[PDB]
Ligand binder design. Structure first.
Ligand SMILES: [Cu+2]
Ligand SMILES: [Cu+2]
Lengths: 128, 128
C-alpha cells in the first residue's frame, strides 16, 4: 500500500501529525522526519521514536542521560521499535522497519526523546 | 544602591539583557524574571540561574534529568548561587540573594537551564 510517511517537526516543539497510519499490506514502512524553522539540534532537536504506548515515557527517561550523541536513547533499548537520529532545522532522516514488528492487538505510539519534548511531541501509530 | 533588576524572556528564546551589573553596596540582590509572548512553560519555559561561568554547562546538563518539577536543576546543586522557577508566558518570579556569596575575582554568569536553551540564553554578571 502507501508505505511511507513524512512528518515535520518544528521550532515550536511539535510534530505536524498526531497519528501515523500503517496499512497492513506493507511489509516495510518508512518514516521520514524533517525539521522546519531555523533552530539547531542542540537547542531544539527532534527525533521520532516508535514503541508500545506504555513504553514511551520509560524510554524517554532512560534516554535523558544517553546524550545527543546517542540520539537520546539508551544504547540497545529493546523497547524501541524504530527510531531516527536527532535532527536540527534543515536536516532530514528516515527509518524503515518491518511492519511485522507491530504485534496486532497492541497499542503503539511515536514520540520525540529530546529531554522534555515528549510532553508535547507524541502521537499514535495505527495499523489498518 | 539600586539592588534589583528585571529581566524579560521571550518566545524567541532570548533574555532582554546580556549582563547583570551588581553594585557592591548591595548587601542583597533581587532579580525579577518575566516572560512575554504566549508560549506555555512546557514548550518555552524559562528560568534564570546564577553560577560561576565554568559551571553553567555542567549545571544545565545535570538539570536535564531533574525535570520541570525541580525547575530543571539538580536538587541542592552546590554550584547554583540563586535561581528562579521555570515560568511560562504571563508568569513572573523573583529571587533575592546575598551578594556576599559572589567571590571576588571569580567569573559569574546567568543562564536558562530549560533543555537546550543555554546556548541562546546566557549572559554575564558584573560585580561593580
Ligand atoms: Cu523534540
Ligand atoms: Cu529558557
Amino acid at each position: 500500500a502507501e508505505c511511507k510517511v513524512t512528518v515535520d517537526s518544528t521550532d515550536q516543539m511539535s510534530f505536524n501529525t498526531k497519528d501515523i497510519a500503517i496499512d497492513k499490506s506493507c511489509k516495510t514502512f518508512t518514516v521520514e522526519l524533517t525539521h522546519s524553522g531555523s533552530l539547531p539540534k542542540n537547542v531544539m532537536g527532534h527525533n521520532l521514536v516508535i514503541s508500545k504506548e506504555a513504553d514511551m515515557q520509560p524510554i524517554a527517561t532512560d534516554g535523558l542521560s544517553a546524550g545527543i550523541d546517542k540520539q537520546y536513547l539508551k544504547d540497545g533499548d529493546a523497547r524501541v521499535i524504530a527510531h531516527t537520529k536527532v535532527i536540527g532545522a534543515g536536516e532530514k532522516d528516515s527509518v524503515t522497519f518491518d511492519v511485522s514488528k507491530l504485534a496486532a492487538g497492541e497499542k503503539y505510539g511515536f514520540f520525540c526523546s529530546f529531554p522534555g519534548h515528549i510532553s508535547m511531541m507524541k502521537g499514535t501509530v495505527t495499523l489498518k
